[PDB]
RNA sequence: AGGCGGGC
DNA sequence: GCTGCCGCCGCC
């Protein structure tokens, strides 16, 4: 009877978890929880859906096999979901985090299904008539044309028109496809959007799951009589001078600078100024290379071809509390707010496009860019040092470059 | 208006019954009124949020007693706002973002000529609200100086979440970058709304922009707001030289010079690509000059306060009246004339 | 760029 | 009172 119930509850490889299930409790909850935490970790890192799918695919095979005919793997998926409802129902923040991660897990799994299995799951969204399609044909084609070009690689207009003739449209309230409306990817008429089915199913899933978590919380005090409380508490907590004002502009000295300092000097020469973070990054670097306080004031006054003198002396520990501020290392530089238009602070290995970096660097370039793509900016910078002659401080890059000539 | 003029206005003239019946959505007082936020702005610069009113009589008596220079309408809450110590979808359109394209008025002046910018903005927004969103129950209200407020009162519009309000705004707010020193470079092909809006605005471009406002007769202004709409540097440099050699050509002449110089510059098998691109730049400029330039903040959140219809404008004395197709700012009654 | 104080 | 903006004063 239990097997027949699970055969009926899982006619599809996907479920809305509508009916309650009729060491395993802890392991199955932990294994689902690890997948949900990896999803949330990838979402917080702004990874694309395809990168997230690639990372989670091996974790599914290990921790929570999807698409198996095994009754035990199907049981593990159900019971882990319902066990996590008991864990995450307790606070609004825990419910919102669980609904978000679980709805994203649903999206990934739906995309990993075959088109046949997706259709069966939907059966277990009204198409428009051919007349309504003919009436709206021009407006529907104008809206969808760009999507056919960029998503289906249909570069020729004849091929786009032929595809559009066969293509069906779904009529729904526009409130169900707000994300597609914001991007103008759907046609709008009289409060209806002409399409996105996965977003509708995901919103219904999220709404239903949130309602069921509230119901679960209302019944939870009856369960406080049971073995389970320590595990539920623990799982819920598991979620928780040679160098002078003139020489610093010369090739002899500047050939020793890392890319961030070259970028700051170029911005200063071009704009006759640097904004706050850039002034601090460059001022402290120049202090670190041995530019005296008096020469630094000459440098800045000359470069800016009441408001500034004090700040430059303060960087040298000559004012206020007299703290001799240490020059910034790469970690510190990277921690500052990201540079925008008109800013020159930061790290070019992170902040510049591969196109700009490649032009500056022109097999060696590919090696540097591979490090950049991985977020290993100091490794990319170390590679540039070695190829042009681990460093993680602009002043160490300069000092090492000078040591090679001494 | 003096403080006594405002007392007289609220005593004898302000349509409290009609505003109450509008905001209450029923003939009988309901939670749509009892739980609605009002903010009162006073002549002292004081600003009092979280007022709420139980009846037409309570609403009238509290506004008469308070004598505010204006009040602002907020959301319907789950509890009465006045007990705090224990919304219509709205659009705002002002003239400020059209100041770079008008010559008939300067600074905070308005006339029937530049009011055509607001009239076209209302026409294009109304087309989207009716045809794309299916809204039926909306009204435009004069802001009392040089703008207009839309109030969409459809039940579906009232119940929109801040995410849905943002999506409605992002659909209607085509001109996100208001800077006139740069080409818009709008996405091609145009979305159906934007294509329809262009065809609705095109018939007005010659009569409003090239003839009545004529903003590009001034060669410095043409260099600042007409030339940056073009895509090609050689065309821009050639037009700039040609207008330096031939000063004070009208906006209509300068508009034709663009096509004549482009036809002289772009020859051979690539000419059709340049012709298409120039047409696209001229179309983007029709939209830059005449398309609705909404205030984006007031629309985004359900909690945003907006000035009530029939408020007095404190600097002009104009009543913030409902707008019809015939409306111009000179038709708005002043409180002193009504007295 | 951030924080604190004063004035309009 | 708070909020927000503008100016000044150092600090960090
Ligand atoms: S890795 Fe460090 S030294 Fe190198 S360019 Fe980036 S911030 Fe500068």
XYZ file of C-alpha atoms (C1' of nucleotides) and ligand atoms in Angstrom:
773
model
C 0.000 0.000 0.000
C 2.928 2.300 0.794
C 4.539 1.384 -2.607
C 1.198 2.074 -4.419
C 0.895 5.449 -2.634
C 4.473 6.387 -3.694
C 3.799 5.087 -7.257
C 0.751 7.464 -7.420
C 2.494 10.424 -5.677
C 5.439 10.078 -8.160
C 3.853 9.318 -11.526
C 6.059 12.325 -12.448
C 9.812 12.604 -11.556
C 8.835 15.977 -9.956
C 6.316 16.743 -7.138
C 4.603 19.739 -5.465
C 4.852 17.795 -2.135
C 1.059 17.966 -1.661
C 0.467 14.899 0.533
C 2.460 14.051 3.709
C 4.770 10.972 3.544
C 3.172 7.779 4.868
C 19.228 7.908 11.208
C 17.328 8.158 7.879
C 15.430 11.215 9.230
C 18.690 13.048 10.065
C 20.831 11.922 7.055
C 18.066 12.658 4.501
C 17.462 16.120 6.009
C 21.245 16.907 6.095
C 21.703 15.715 2.476
C 18.865 17.947 1.136
C 20.067 20.813 3.365
C 23.622 20.635 1.856
C 22.144 20.978 -1.676
C 19.969 23.955 -0.588
C 22.971 25.685 1.079
C 25.065 25.148 -2.102
C 22.189 26.709 -4.142
C 22.056 29.713 -1.756
C 25.903 30.035 -1.835
C 25.802 30.101 -5.664
C 22.863 32.600 -5.728
C 24.728 34.953 -3.312
C 27.741 34.798 -5.729
C 25.465 35.889 -8.669
C 26.262 32.705 -10.690
C 24.233 32.064 -13.859
C 21.538 29.306 -13.861
C 23.766 27.135 -16.168
C 26.800 27.416 -13.826
C 24.576 26.531 -10.830
C 23.198 23.504 -12.772
C 26.797 22.355 -13.548
C 27.888 22.624 -9.850
C 24.786 20.884 -8.404
C 24.586 17.989 -10.967
C 27.410 15.973 -9.223
C 25.888 16.750 -5.766
C 22.540 15.282 -6.901
C 24.205 11.981 -7.915
C 25.935 11.786 -4.480
C 23.428 13.200 -1.961
C 19.973 13.199 -3.570
C 19.674 11.191 -6.824
C 16.988 12.631 -9.112
C 15.531 10.749 -12.125
C 15.976 7.229 -10.599
C 13.356 4.429 -10.653
C 14.534 3.591 -7.086
C 11.666 3.858 -4.571
C 14.256 4.670 -1.843
C 15.687 7.731 -3.680
C 12.100 8.982 -4.268
C 11.328 8.423 -0.542
C 14.575 10.275 0.394
C 13.466 13.278 -1.745
C 9.952 13.430 -0.148
C 10.928 12.824 3.434
C 13.875 15.257 3.297
C 11.514 18.009 1.966
C 8.908 17.426 4.742
C 11.621 17.114 7.448
C 13.016 20.501 6.328
C 9.438 21.971 6.557
C 9.565 21.051 10.298
C 13.010 22.752 10.627
C 12.313 25.994 8.676
C 8.638 26.719 9.636
C 9.666 28.452 12.950
C 10.590 32.014 11.831
C 9.575 34.222 8.878
C 13.245 34.559 7.778
C 13.765 30.751 7.844
C 10.540 30.238 5.798
C 11.530 32.861 3.177
C 15.056 31.359 2.813
C 13.682 27.800 2.540
C 10.931 28.777 0.008
C 13.539 30.644 -2.126
C 16.114 27.797 -2.141
C 13.447 25.064 -2.604
C 11.724 26.968 -5.481
C 15.129 27.347 -7.173
C 15.748 23.594 -6.649
C 12.355 22.973 -8.352
C 13.425 25.194 -11.346
C 16.742 23.307 -11.799
C 15.017 19.903 -11.639
C 12.288 20.935 -14.097
C 14.981 22.136 -16.591
C 16.823 18.777 -16.195
C 13.655 16.831 -17.252
C 12.931 15.700 -20.816
C 10.230 17.681 -22.737
C 8.003 14.549 -22.481
C 8.437 14.339 -18.665
C 7.786 18.127 -18.333
C 4.525 17.739 -20.328
C 3.432 14.733 -18.190
C 4.202 16.690 -14.986
C 2.186 19.732 -16.165
C -0.739 17.406 -17.013
C -0.556 15.659 -13.581
C -2.106 28.319 -19.499
C -4.693 28.724 -22.305
C -3.375 28.635 -25.884
C -4.819 31.380 -28.142
C -6.911 30.512 -31.229
C -5.389 30.646 -34.726
C -7.751 33.627 -35.402
C -6.533 35.615 -32.330
C -2.930 34.778 -33.437
C -3.672 36.087 -36.977
C -5.217 39.367 -35.642
C -2.231 40.034 -33.299
C 0.395 38.525 -35.684
C 2.373 41.741 -36.390
C 2.593 42.759 -32.683
C 3.423 39.198 -31.522
C 6.177 38.888 -34.189
C 7.724 42.308 -33.329
C 7.898 41.323 -29.624
C 9.273 37.784 -30.162
C 11.647 38.569 -33.129
C 14.570 39.632 -30.883
C 14.115 36.541 -28.637
C 14.132 34.221 -31.726
C 17.371 35.867 -32.930
C 19.267 35.815 -29.581
C 17.887 32.634 -27.875
C 17.397 30.348 -30.943
C 20.285 31.788 -33.096
C 17.833 32.461 -36.004
C 19.867 35.164 -37.823
C 17.837 35.068 -41.097
C 14.436 36.851 -41.145
C 12.850 34.122 -43.334
C 13.753 31.421 -40.749
C 12.326 33.600 -37.899
C 9.036 34.083 -39.844
C 8.763 30.332 -40.584
C 9.341 29.453 -36.887
C 6.809 32.122 -35.746
C 4.099 30.607 -38.024
C 4.434 27.236 -36.185
C 4.900 28.811 -32.710
C 1.943 28.727 -30.250
C 1.084 31.526 -27.805
C -0.273 31.266 -24.261
C -2.566 34.007 -22.894
C -2.204 34.739 -19.169
C -2.664 37.695 -16.743
C 0.498 39.845 -16.988
C 1.001 39.617 -13.154
C 2.190 35.993 -13.621
C 5.090 37.067 -15.971
C 6.258 40.385 -14.401
C 9.953 39.466 -15.076
C 9.253 39.056 -18.842
C 7.133 42.257 -18.888
C 10.019 44.297 -17.365
C 12.329 43.084 -20.183
C 9.622 43.587 -22.944
C 9.916 39.867 -23.858
C 6.089 39.365 -23.927
C 3.317 41.187 -25.791
C 0.688 42.975 -23.636
C -2.986 43.657 -24.513
C -5.942 44.429 -22.173
C -4.140 43.183 -18.977
C -3.022 39.904 -20.646
C 0.494 38.767 -21.546
C 1.050 36.668 -24.684
C 3.867 34.178 -23.970
C 7.402 31.342 -19.382
C 5.417 28.304 -18.058
C 8.246 27.446 -15.601
C 7.919 30.863 -13.874
C 4.148 30.334 -13.377
C 4.734 26.824 -11.922
C 7.554 28.135 -9.680
C 5.368 30.960 -8.284
C 2.485 28.514 -7.589
C 4.986 26.124 -5.922
C 6.459 28.967 -3.794
C 2.977 30.229 -2.741
C 1.731 26.707 -1.834
C 4.964 25.863 0.042
C 4.772 29.125 2.050
C 1.118 28.379 3.041
C 2.068 24.803 4.072
C 5.007 26.096 6.214
C 2.558 28.402 8.081
C 0.174 25.431 8.662
C 3.161 23.259 9.764
C 4.161 25.943 12.320
C 0.586 26.032 13.782
C 0.737 22.236 14.437
C 4.416 22.199 15.611
C 3.522 22.666 19.375
C 1.823 19.198 19.324
C 5.122 17.690 18.085
C 7.113 19.265 20.997
C 6.091 16.114 22.988
C 8.455 13.927 20.830
C 13.628 12.429 19.690
C 13.047 15.053 16.943
C 13.515 18.413 18.764
C 17.372 18.217 19.045
C 17.716 17.328 15.327
C 15.234 20.079 14.270
C 17.052 22.655 16.473
C 20.485 21.584 15.147
C 19.361 21.601 11.450
C 17.711 25.046 11.875
C 20.990 26.342 13.435
C 23.100 24.662 10.673
C 21.797 27.442 8.344
C 23.611 29.919 10.692
C 65.636 61.850 -2.957
C 65.710 59.332 -5.904
C 61.934 58.888 -5.488
C 60.570 62.436 -5.730
C 57.623 64.456 -7.107
C 59.117 64.415 -10.651
C 60.708 60.935 -10.812
C 57.467 59.099 -9.956
C 56.231 60.151 -13.460
C 59.387 58.841 -15.191
C 59.648 55.500 -17.055
C 62.606 54.417 -14.874
C 60.395 54.474 -11.772
C 56.977 53.776 -13.322
C 58.155 50.611 -15.130
C 58.086 49.023 -11.607
C 54.406 49.804 -10.938
C 51.650 47.197 -10.912
C 48.607 47.738 -13.137
C 46.434 49.412 -10.433
C 49.076 52.101 -9.836
C 49.617 52.573 -13.603
C 45.797 53.014 -13.909
C 45.697 55.563 -11.059
C 48.615 57.549 -12.533
C 46.903 57.549 -15.961
C 43.607 58.773 -14.441
C 45.464 61.490 -12.524
C 47.353 62.642 -15.650
C 44.176 62.595 -17.814
C 41.739 64.228 -15.322
C 44.108 66.385 -13.219
C 42.425 64.856 -10.180
C 41.545 61.594 -8.476
C 38.412 60.904 -6.441
C 38.662 59.765 -2.803
C 39.461 56.053 -2.990
C 41.912 56.533 -5.830
C 43.696 59.383 -3.989
C 44.038 57.209 -0.911
C 45.203 54.108 -2.808
C 47.842 56.088 -4.731
C 48.909 58.380 -1.818
C 49.570 55.450 0.504
C 51.352 53.458 -2.227
C 53.674 56.431 -2.946
C 54.371 56.825 0.778
C 55.252 53.078 0.822
C 57.811 53.488 -2.018
C 59.528 56.311 -0.105
C 57.987 59.535 -1.434
C 58.543 62.047 1.405
C 55.631 64.076 2.867
C 57.047 67.299 1.340
C 57.555 65.673 -2.085
C 54.047 64.140 -1.955
C 52.455 67.566 -1.371
C 54.450 68.924 -4.396
C 53.345 65.893 -6.453
C 49.620 66.378 -5.706
C 49.665 70.204 -6.034
C 51.414 69.882 -9.415
C 49.136 67.064 -10.631
C 45.941 69.011 -9.710
C 46.636 71.475 -12.590
C 41.535 74.347 2.279
C 40.377 70.895 1.242
C 43.346 68.694 0.386
C 46.637 69.654 2.115
C 45.573 68.344 5.531
C 44.335 64.977 4.099
C 47.674 64.295 2.381
C 49.640 65.162 5.577
C 47.160 63.005 7.586
C 48.069 60.019 5.350
C 51.694 60.468 6.624
C 50.680 60.395 10.322
C 51.346 64.132 10.665
C 47.850 65.126 11.835
C 45.165 64.374 14.446
C 45.886 61.022 16.158
C 49.173 60.826 14.106
C 48.551 57.273 12.868
C 51.123 56.337 10.211
C 48.561 54.568 8.006
C 49.841 51.435 6.365
C 49.728 51.276 2.527
C 46.848 49.093 1.289
C 47.416 45.496 0.310
C 45.414 43.890 -2.543
C 42.867 42.445 -0.115
C 42.223 45.989 1.210
C 42.093 47.539 -2.294
C 39.616 44.855 -3.449
C 37.422 45.470 -0.332
C 36.705 49.087 -1.276
C 33.452 49.964 -3.118
C 33.793 48.866 -6.780
C 34.966 51.663 -9.098
C 32.382 53.284 -11.337
C 32.729 55.684 -14.256
C 35.325 58.318 -13.374
C 36.979 56.142 -10.666
C 40.509 54.634 -10.994
C 40.836 52.815 -7.650
C 40.488 49.044 -7.375
C 42.214 46.252 -9.264
C 42.284 46.211 -13.099
C 42.422 42.373 -13.104
C 38.907 42.419 -11.603
C 37.633 45.786 -12.900
C 38.633 45.798 -16.573
C 37.041 43.761 -19.382
C 39.115 40.885 -20.893
C 39.258 43.025 -24.096
C 40.941 45.924 -22.206
C 43.280 43.639 -20.215
C 44.340 41.760 -23.399
C 45.180 45.067 -25.150
C 47.237 46.192 -22.132
C 49.047 42.832 -21.923
C 49.750 42.795 -25.704
C 49.439 31.790 -24.368
C 50.657 34.131 -21.549
C 47.559 36.365 -21.900
C 45.216 33.316 -21.752
C 46.993 32.187 -18.549
C 46.497 35.625 -16.921
C 42.829 35.791 -18.073
C 42.150 32.250 -16.775
C 43.285 33.474 -13.288
C 41.059 36.607 -13.646
C 38.022 34.452 -14.600
C 38.616 32.380 -11.408
C 38.663 35.542 -9.236
C 42.393 34.993 -8.489
C 43.397 38.609 -9.148
C 46.664 38.498 -7.173
C 47.675 35.343 -9.041
C 46.942 37.114 -12.366
C 49.022 40.085 -11.144
C 51.870 37.755 -10.011
C 51.824 36.151 -13.498
C 52.118 39.606 -15.107
C 55.034 40.422 -12.768
C 56.852 37.201 -13.711
C 56.102 37.369 -17.411
C 57.213 41.075 -17.695
C 60.432 40.607 -15.671
C 52.853 35.138 -4.910
C 52.601 38.959 -4.643
C 49.487 40.413 -2.914
C 50.523 43.984 -2.164
C 51.265 46.758 -4.721
C 54.252 47.915 -2.617
C 55.720 44.368 -2.680
C 55.271 44.299 -6.484
C 57.203 47.597 -6.730
C 59.907 46.507 -4.220
C 60.423 43.130 -5.964
C 60.641 44.852 -9.350
C 63.313 47.214 -7.924
C 65.215 44.341 -6.266
C 65.607 42.715 -9.726
C 67.673 45.769 -10.899
C 69.845 46.044 -7.670
C -3.148 82.136 -0.806
C -3.243 83.414 2.813
C -4.088 81.076 5.745
C -7.625 82.605 5.827
C -8.033 81.897 2.068
C -7.257 78.202 2.771
C -9.781 78.194 5.703
C -12.424 79.622 3.336
C -11.518 77.055 0.639
C -11.883 74.023 2.952
C -15.041 75.495 4.559
C -17.003 76.290 1.397
C -15.362 74.950 -1.818
C -13.359 71.694 -1.350
C -15.412 68.654 -2.651
C -14.961 66.440 0.513
C -17.969 64.179 -0.306
C -16.691 63.340 -3.823
C -13.072 62.718 -2.664
C -14.336 60.530 0.217
C -16.632 58.506 -2.117
C -13.729 58.055 -4.597
C -11.222 56.789 -1.975
C -13.807 54.700 -0.047
C -14.841 52.735 -3.240
C -18.386 52.435 -1.745
C -21.375 54.674 -0.778
C -21.030 53.384 2.861
C -17.864 54.227 4.920
C -15.428 51.275 4.842
C -11.844 50.274 5.780
C -10.692 51.704 2.384
C -11.209 55.121 4.059
C -10.868 54.407 7.845
C -7.492 52.659 7.272
C -6.228 55.092 4.578
C -3.178 57.232 5.308
C -3.276 60.993 4.839
C -0.302 63.298 5.271
C -0.807 67.033 5.994
C 1.777 69.635 4.905
C 1.597 72.930 6.852
C 2.690 76.509 6.017
C 5.315 76.220 8.808
C 7.073 73.415 6.831
C 5.702 70.886 9.376
C 4.621 67.540 7.850
C 2.231 65.185 9.718
C 1.876 61.594 8.404
C -0.517 58.789 9.434
C -3.821 60.702 9.701
C -7.029 58.757 8.867
C -10.746 59.643 8.674
C -13.947 57.711 9.457
C -16.598 59.723 7.522
C -17.111 62.727 5.186
C -17.856 64.795 8.341
C -14.686 63.613 10.178
C -12.535 64.201 7.050
C -13.959 67.740 6.569
C -13.741 68.717 10.274
C -10.107 67.511 10.656
C -8.904 69.280 7.448
C -10.769 72.529 8.394
C -9.245 72.392 11.930
C -5.718 71.633 10.649
C -5.871 74.111 7.688
C -2.927 72.472 5.789
C -1.429 74.125 2.643
C -2.021 70.635 1.086
C -2.654 67.017 1.986
C -1.404 63.815 0.351
C -3.193 60.457 -0.122
C -1.460 57.212 0.930
C -2.158 53.477 1.112
C -5.028 51.539 2.682
C -3.555 49.723 5.716
C -4.567 46.643 7.733
C -5.152 49.007 10.777
C -6.167 52.733 11.156
C -3.049 54.959 10.513
C -4.171 57.429 13.261
C -3.706 54.583 15.828
C -0.021 54.032 14.755
C 1.395 55.201 18.120
C -0.331 52.218 19.893
C -3.297 52.050 -3.151
C -4.251 53.574 -6.500
C -1.484 53.127 -9.095
C -0.117 56.648 -9.648
C 2.006 58.446 -12.239
C 3.516 61.940 -12.036
C 4.635 63.972 -15.080
C 6.312 67.385 -14.757
C 7.596 69.867 -17.380
C 11.189 69.942 -15.954
C 12.470 67.064 -18.158
C 11.105 68.913 -21.280
C 12.836 72.264 -20.401
C 15.726 71.457 -22.825
C 13.215 71.278 -25.770
C 10.935 74.312 -25.136
C 11.500 78.005 -25.969
C 7.972 79.366 -25.300
C 8.576 79.402 -21.481
C 11.604 79.602 -19.142
C 12.186 78.245 -15.625
C 8.920 77.517 -13.837
C 6.565 79.182 -16.419
C 4.018 77.166 -18.493
C 1.661 77.981 -21.414
C -0.640 76.073 -23.848
C 2.367 75.590 -26.241
C 4.600 73.604 -23.831
C 1.495 72.006 -22.208
C 1.364 69.901 -25.444
C 4.345 67.904 -23.994
C 2.139 66.926 -20.980
C -0.909 66.350 -23.284
C 1.148 63.914 -25.429
C 2.588 62.280 -22.280
C -1.002 61.677 -20.993
C -2.091 60.367 -24.478
C 0.792 57.826 -24.693
C 0.441 56.696 -21.036
C -3.380 56.366 -21.499
C -2.833 54.213 -24.621
C -0.633 51.814 -22.584
C -2.952 51.788 -19.491
C -6.055 51.057 -21.650
C -4.757 48.807 -24.457
C -1.877 46.903 -22.755
C -2.988 46.756 -19.066
C -6.800 46.782 -19.642
C -7.369 49.568 -17.044
C -10.716 51.412 -17.222
C -10.946 53.643 -14.137
C -8.209 56.297 -14.295
C -8.207 60.110 -14.063
C -5.592 62.810 -14.722
C -5.298 65.729 -12.285
C -3.453 69.016 -12.798
C -0.515 69.359 -10.341
C -1.432 73.097 -9.907
C 1.610 74.439 -11.862
C 3.184 72.594 -14.847
C 2.563 68.830 -14.370
C -0.204 66.202 -14.135
C -0.910 63.228 -11.816
C -2.629 60.029 -13.023
C -4.721 58.010 -10.525
C -5.576 54.442 -11.668
C -8.383 53.181 -9.419
C -9.148 49.755 -11.037
C -9.309 47.047 -8.261
C -6.460 45.168 -10.068
C -4.311 48.364 -10.091
C -5.050 49.111 -6.381
C -3.932 45.587 -5.341
C -0.542 45.712 -7.198
C 2.546 44.772 -5.177
C 5.647 47.026 -5.368
C 7.267 44.453 -7.759
C 4.240 44.631 -10.097
C 4.139 48.490 -9.844
C 7.850 48.551 -10.787
C 7.137 46.271 -13.796
C 4.259 48.569 -14.956
C 6.576 51.594 -14.517
C 9.506 49.899 -16.371
C 7.092 49.086 -19.280
C 5.909 52.751 -19.595
C 9.273 54.452 -18.690
C 11.050 54.003 -22.076
C 13.330 57.076 -21.605
C 15.341 55.899 -18.548
C 18.367 58.116 -19.290
C 17.113 61.752 -19.391
C 20.514 63.177 -20.489
C 20.137 65.098 -23.808
C 23.941 65.207 -24.439
C 23.840 61.487 -25.439
C 22.163 59.261 -28.038
C 19.479 57.002 -26.476
C 20.429 54.095 -28.808
C 17.102 52.336 -28.063
C 16.846 48.517 -28.490
C 15.945 47.308 -32.033
C 13.484 46.109 -33.208
C 11.206 48.350 -31.111
C 8.818 46.713 -28.639
C 5.162 47.006 -29.960
C 4.340 49.711 -27.324
C 7.354 51.811 -28.427
C 6.571 51.338 -32.168
C 2.899 52.387 -31.543
C 4.063 55.362 -29.412
C 6.426 56.533 -32.200
C 3.570 56.460 -34.787
C 1.311 58.422 -32.357
C 4.049 61.085 -31.711
C 5.430 61.482 -35.311
C 2.487 63.716 -36.539
C 3.202 66.219 -33.698
C 7.019 66.372 -34.103
C 7.078 68.910 -36.988
C 4.408 71.256 -35.540
C 5.666 71.129 -31.891
C 9.462 70.607 -32.128
C 10.477 72.024 -35.536
C 7.987 74.959 -35.784
C 6.350 76.010 -32.439
C 9.316 75.408 -30.064
C 12.065 75.655 -32.768
C 14.752 74.932 -30.051
C 17.568 74.161 -32.561
C 17.471 77.529 -34.383
C 20.062 78.415 -31.727
C 23.288 76.828 -33.044
C 24.747 76.207 -29.534
C 21.529 74.461 -28.487
C 21.552 72.388 -31.741
C 25.185 71.370 -30.916
C 24.113 70.435 -27.324
C 20.826 68.491 -27.958
C 20.387 67.773 -31.738
C 23.924 66.633 -32.751
C 24.391 64.166 -29.802
C 21.311 62.219 -31.029
C 23.268 61.222 -34.212
C 25.390 58.027 -34.402
C 28.190 59.094 -36.795
C 31.100 61.407 -35.907
C 31.859 62.439 -39.542
C 28.196 63.488 -40.017
C 28.242 65.401 -36.660
C 31.523 67.218 -37.540
C 30.210 68.045 -41.085
C 26.865 69.421 -39.746
C 28.698 71.393 -37.010
C 30.965 72.971 -39.671
C 28.014 73.618 -42.035
C 25.971 75.388 -39.278
C 29.043 77.432 -38.172
C 29.354 78.590 -41.828
C 25.513 79.074 -42.098
C 24.318 80.302 -38.640
C 20.696 80.467 -37.310
C 19.138 77.930 -39.719
C 15.681 76.988 -38.338
C 15.064 73.610 -36.594
C 13.213 72.533 -39.805
C 16.178 73.468 -42.045
C 18.681 71.770 -39.657
C 16.425 68.661 -39.658
C 16.655 68.505 -43.496
C 20.428 69.333 -43.536
C 20.995 66.101 -41.532
C 19.532 64.021 -44.425
C 21.227 66.056 -47.216
C 24.724 65.902 -45.630
C 24.264 62.187 -44.735
C 23.306 61.413 -48.397
C 26.460 63.285 -49.566
C 28.752 61.408 -47.078
C 27.398 57.819 -47.178
C 27.899 56.410 -50.718
C 28.153 52.895 -52.200
C 26.973 49.396 -51.069
C 26.918 50.327 -47.315
C 24.669 53.433 -47.815
C 21.438 51.527 -46.929
C 22.852 50.599 -43.472
C 23.678 54.298 -42.823
C 20.172 55.394 -44.043
C 18.493 52.840 -41.704
C 20.754 53.956 -38.818
C 20.042 57.671 -39.398
C 16.267 56.967 -39.478
C 16.651 55.051 -36.171
C 18.498 58.060 -34.626
C 15.751 60.480 -35.792
C 13.074 58.097 -34.377
C 14.947 57.868 -31.019
C 15.035 61.738 -31.022
C 11.226 61.983 -31.664
C 10.874 59.803 -28.533
C 13.540 61.775 -26.568
C 11.646 65.050 -27.216
C 7.951 63.994 -26.973
C 7.677 60.624 -25.116
C 6.361 60.608 -21.453
C 9.085 61.497 -18.892
C 7.560 60.030 -15.704
C 8.722 60.697 -12.130
C 9.726 57.127 -11.294
C 9.670 57.196 -7.461
C 5.945 57.905 -6.821
C 4.838 54.847 -8.892
C 7.185 52.150 -7.424
C 5.820 51.637 -3.891
C 2.294 51.163 -2.534
C 3.204 53.473 0.440
C 4.082 56.600 -1.641
C 2.067 59.714 -0.782
C 0.741 61.918 -3.621
C -1.035 65.325 -3.485
C -4.828 65.030 -3.329
C -7.022 66.218 -6.246
C -8.501 69.703 -5.603
C -5.572 70.776 -3.325
C -4.461 74.422 -3.791
C -0.983 75.021 -5.201
C 0.705 77.287 -2.575
C 2.644 79.464 -5.102
C 0.066 79.785 -7.976
C -3.291 79.667 -6.115
C -4.499 77.186 -8.798
C -6.856 74.348 -7.825
C -5.441 70.862 -8.673
C -8.467 70.047 -10.930
C -9.251 66.909 -13.025
C -8.054 67.125 -16.671
C -10.078 66.595 -19.875
C -8.886 66.634 -23.549
C -9.518 70.436 -23.703
C -7.469 71.299 -20.576
C -4.656 73.866 -20.495
C -3.058 75.317 -17.262
C -4.682 78.767 -17.850
C -8.140 77.074 -17.439
C -7.349 75.997 -13.847
C -9.430 78.203 -11.471
C -7.472 80.214 -8.867
C -8.688 80.355 -5.261
C -8.787 84.214 -5.319
C -11.005 84.200 -8.452
C -13.307 81.554 -6.855
C -13.564 83.734 -3.674
C 33.795 58.266 0.284
C 31.937 57.409 5.500
C 30.827 59.176 10.703
C 29.993 63.247 14.465
C 28.869 68.568 15.816
C 26.982 73.693 14.555
C 24.102 77.235 11.303
C 20.314 78.308 7.316
C 11.344 65.712 16.673
C 12.690 63.757 12.483
C 13.842 63.883 7.536
C 16.709 65.747 3.256
C 19.772 69.160 0.911
C 23.823 73.115 0.962
C 28.237 75.300 3.636
C 32.288 75.056 7.502
C 35.519 72.223 11.099
C 38.913 68.845 12.063
C 38.958 62.681 12.906
C 38.905 58.031 10.923
S 46.511 42.310 -7.793
Fe 46.996 43.997 -6.270
S 48.996 45.011 -6.969
Fe 48.104 43.771 -8.710
S 46.892 45.301 -9.980
Fe 45.428 44.219 -8.469
S 45.338 45.543 -6.561
Fe 47.209 46.213 -7.831
